[PDB]
Design a protein around this ligand. Structure first.
Ligand SMILES: *C(=O)CCCC[C@@H]1SC[C@@H]2NC(=O)N[C@@H]21
Ligand SMILES: [Mn+2]
Ligand SMILES: [Mn+2]
Lengths: 675, 94, 192, 9
């Protein structure tokens, strides 16, 4: 259209003109430029020439239009008609309202938790403090590891930030919050299409007292393949810049050499650094393995101390450290090395609490617990249950029990938003003690055995896993090392192989050949030369860790590539994210373009759209909230496009959405008619 | 000087002041009653708050303290009373 | 069978259901000629250390074998057992793994491996106990229409003391009375 | 008689 405004001063005519344009919402036009023409001081001066637009450069430096609700309409539109991936297309169910605890932001600003301690004494002071505490310090895994195990890591940021206040007050005496890394980088940008950095930043703001902890893989940080050291540093600094303060560092084959580069970065950044031994085997069974003995675990701790880690941590990623094994392992570790010990288990045998209470007796300093309603099975032991279990025993778990129950009740209702993604695991699986299948593997591997038509032949797949372990030496079962032993167990049962058979016919499994090249590390048993030779059939077996065969990445070119592609301003987080996960970031950006920030929608609306005649309020954040009412969808018109009659912020709107569900020779009543 | 302004009114004059306030780059808080939740004026502002669910229509635009809470809670510098509600209420201005 | 209520670790939980009340109850049962003294903890209320001092007590005071039974509604039923086992228990009540947990009895398949390293030893066949679980896990899926809504440990039983499935079946009825949302006052009234 | 008549890949 054309817009005319008027005032007593050319400026006020210009001010009026400006807002008349933004208030003018036509949801792709000249508006941003013309607004810049108004706020152009050269215009206001009242003297220009025909070459006013050509002369001035950043007139065209328009800022993108606040499409906003028109995009939010498109999303709720597309999902309401065509559903959401991996979710049974059902009308948006009726969940409970689940009122949420809050705590004054001024009061939470009064707390002085264990981040204050890192801001007063260094990392070494935080570690030397933990030692002194007689009480049991707890790390909480609800924001990260608990829902990775139980809900395919689908828990969205909106559900975390909405309790962040109470969580910051409940775990105010807690060591750390586990919230980032693991698989929360990949699943966020790709599945929930939400930025993990904003999960980090928005939580760091809301929870400023407790330390923030993540799970960092030594080989590749949060990546999927192998990376040059140059990128391991970049990512570690930027997470450190954004609030991460406790980096747990593990390697899939307990190989210290790969953990050194991810280590120099955490020292450099000045945060806490957890060197971790991943636990395999049975310390109580002498006949189970001659490699992973109590001597090995005490050696690695001394190795882990010499390499300069601030806390030694133990990761029972398959629930294989039995209650009595916990008692000896930690107590024998506690007296040989002088770091605090950070124990982490998964309650797959149902003995997770029994591991801990034993572990506390041997004097463990920090334990990994999840809130009750998100605990048990392939998750962490219940913090709630544990607190009461130490009733009567000398040691006490430093936490806010009544605050945890409130945190449990909230998470109990919230989880039902995510019931589409529940694991199939309903009960403890005590036979992990044989096959050593990691968390959610003896179920995930069963669905893959069914694919090959081995679904009812699972005894021979379970047994093959345990055989495959011994076949590759005695190795550690954790991603990616668990994937190779997995893929290797199907293969031999796929075409009827055994131990000596796979060597004897070898010259006649993409992960396995990647493994025997050493592309994931160097095993603590080495390789079997005869076994090795037949799998890769002759190429370069890596003679050192994978990182040093890799050229450092030029992050300046990446910044150029993204700036040409995107609008312009590319931040460092944008950079390392593209480097670590190219396709997903690229895809995440395209999705960000179409639909805006979906990390703001309530989790049900994110997953189900809305139903006919329902109203939905969205926190655009802090006082700004938009209200949407779905009136009706139409039948598909001549094409496959339906008309959704909307009501947003009082103004009626409509969106048109693609529905997914001679000449001619026609037939009318069994009669072949031709045009 | 006046970062963010709140209008203790509704409808035509509230929409009016919200326009002049935007023109000078001022954020605008609106207030609305239960019976006014579907008003035009509550969507023209940068923020919006129901004064009191307990308070009933006319009271929601006439409770001095229930309004001022909203203002303080929202980091307000100035209140424009519009015309007719509290525009002439010496004690409100106090 | 002594029906266990409250807590014997808190001196100000009750003035009545205290440690010596159960001892006095047990001797009477011996004097009344029952061949086995069994403790029916119908609510998962017998905390680990409480189990060590209740059992170690009666083990001396009554000359009957002791038969323990509990529900893992707190998530500490196995710990309760492992304590009583180390305090001289004779028989425990367990369910096969896939049919255990929560308001059921503690997991048999787990407690077997739990005791690896400690003095005693669960007399049973794990190899057979695994197969029984793989069976019962499946047969259980024909009864999905009847599973409780309890999906995780609930520590608040240590307050209201509701037994096997009464903080499940109550909230069900409580909603059918205009008070389901206000179930904080029911869990305070029921406690009261 | 013969009659003549989730999102993931
Ligand atoms: C179907 O493909 C349309 C669904 C709308 C897109 C949403 S955004 C988050 C989900 N991830 C994805 O790839 N599609 C879903
Ligand atoms: Mn883990
Ligand atoms: Mn019973």
């Amino acid at each position: 259209v054309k817009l005319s405004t008027h005032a007593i001063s050319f400026k006020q005519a210009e001010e009026k003109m400006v807002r008349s344009l933004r208030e003018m919402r036509i949801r792709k036009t000249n508006i941003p430029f013309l607004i810049n023409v108004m706020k152009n001081k050269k215009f206001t001066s009242g003297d220009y020439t025909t070459k006013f637009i050509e002369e001035t450069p950043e007139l065209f430096d328009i800022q993108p239009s606040l499409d906003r609700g028109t995009k939010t309409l498109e999303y709720i539109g597309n999902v309401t008609i065509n559903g959401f991936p991996n979710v049974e297309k059902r009308p948006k169910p009726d969940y409970e309202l689940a009122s949420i605890p809050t705590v004054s932001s001024s009061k939470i600003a009064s707390f002085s938790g264990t981040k204050q301690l890192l801001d007063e004494v260094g990392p070494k002071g935080v570690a030397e403090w933990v030692k002194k505490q007689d009480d049991v310090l707890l790390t909480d895994t609800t924001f990260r590891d608990a829902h990775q195990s139980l809900l395919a890591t689908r828990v969205r940021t909106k559900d975390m930030i909405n309790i962040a206040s109470k969580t910051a007050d409940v775990f105010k005496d807690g060591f750390s919050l586990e919230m980032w890394g693991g698989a929360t980088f990949d699943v966020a940008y790709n599945f929930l299409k939400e930025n993990p950095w904003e999960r980090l930043e928005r939580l760091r703001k809301a929870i400023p007292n407790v330390l923030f902890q993540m799970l960092l893989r030594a080989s590749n940080a949060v990546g999927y393949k192998n990376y040059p050291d140059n990128v391991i540093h970049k990512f570690v600094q930027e997470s450190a810049k954004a609030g991460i303060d406790v980096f747990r560092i593990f390697d899939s084959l307990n190989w210290v050499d790969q953990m050194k580069v991810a280590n120099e970065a955490v020292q450099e950044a000045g945060k806490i650094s957890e060197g971790t031994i991943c636990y395999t085997g049975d310390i109580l069974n002498p006949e189970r393995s001659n490699i992973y003995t109590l001597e090995y675990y005490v050696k690695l701790a001394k190795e882990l101390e010499r390499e300069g880690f601030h806390i030694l941590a133990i990761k029972d990623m398959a629930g294989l450290l039995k209650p009595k094994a916990a008692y000896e392992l930690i107590g024998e570790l506690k007296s040989a090395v002088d770091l605090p010990i950070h124990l982490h288990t998964h309650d797959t045998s149902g003995n997770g609490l029994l591991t801990y209470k034993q572990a506390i007796d041997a004097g463990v300093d920090i334990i990994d617990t999840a809130v009750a309603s998100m605990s048990g099975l392939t998750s962490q032991p219940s913090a709630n249950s544990l607190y009461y279990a130490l009733n009567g025993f000398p040691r006490h778990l430093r936490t806010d029990i009544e605050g945890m129950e409130s945190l449990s009740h909230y998470w109990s209702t919230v989880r039902t938003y995510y019931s589409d993604f529940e694991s199939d695991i309903k009960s403890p699986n005590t036979e992990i003690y044989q096959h050593e299948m990691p968390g959610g593997q003896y179920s995930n591997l069963s669905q893959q055995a069914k694919s090959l038509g081995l679904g009812e032949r699972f005894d021979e797949v379970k047994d093959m896993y345990r055989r495959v372990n011994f076949l590759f030496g005695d190795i550690v079962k954790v991603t990616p090392s668990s994937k190779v032993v997995g893929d290797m167990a199907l293969y031999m049962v796929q075409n009827d192989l055994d131990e000596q058979s796979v060597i004897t016919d070898g010259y006649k499994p993409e992960s396995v050949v990647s493994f025997f090249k050493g592309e994931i590390g160097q095993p603590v048993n080495g390789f079997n030369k005869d076994l090795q030779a037949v799998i890769l059939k002759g190429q370069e077996a890596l003679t050192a860790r994978p990182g040093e065969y890799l050229e450092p990445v030029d992050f300046e070119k990446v910044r150029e590539l993204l700036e040409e592609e995107q609008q312009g301003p590319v931040t460092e987080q944008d950079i390392i994210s593209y480097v670590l996960y190219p396709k997903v970031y690229e895809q995440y950006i395209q999705t960000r373009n179409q639909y805006g920030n979906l990390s703001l929608l309530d989790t049900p609306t994110f997953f189900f759209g809305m139903r006919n005649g329902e109203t939905v309020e969205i926190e655009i954040d802090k006082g700004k909230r938009l209200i949407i009412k779905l009136e009706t969808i139409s039948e598909p018109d001549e094409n496959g496009n339906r008309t959704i009659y909307y009501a947003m912020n009082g103004q009626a709107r409509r969106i048109y959405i693609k529905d997914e569900n001679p000449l001619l020779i026609t037939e009318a009543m069994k009669m072949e008619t031709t045009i | 000087q006046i970062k963010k302004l709140l209008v203790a009114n509704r409808g035509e004059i509230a929409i009016r002041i919200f326009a002049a306030a935007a023109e000078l780059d001022i954020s605008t808080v609106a207030i609305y009653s239960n019976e006014d939740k579907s008003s035009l004026h509550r969507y023209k502002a940068d923020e919006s708050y129901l004064v009191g669910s307990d308070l009933g229509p006319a009271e929601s635009y006439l409770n001095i303290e229930r309004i001022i809470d909203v203002a303080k809670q929202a980091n307000v510098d100035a209140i424009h009373p519009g015309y007719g509600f509290l525009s002439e209420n010496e004690q409100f201005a106090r």
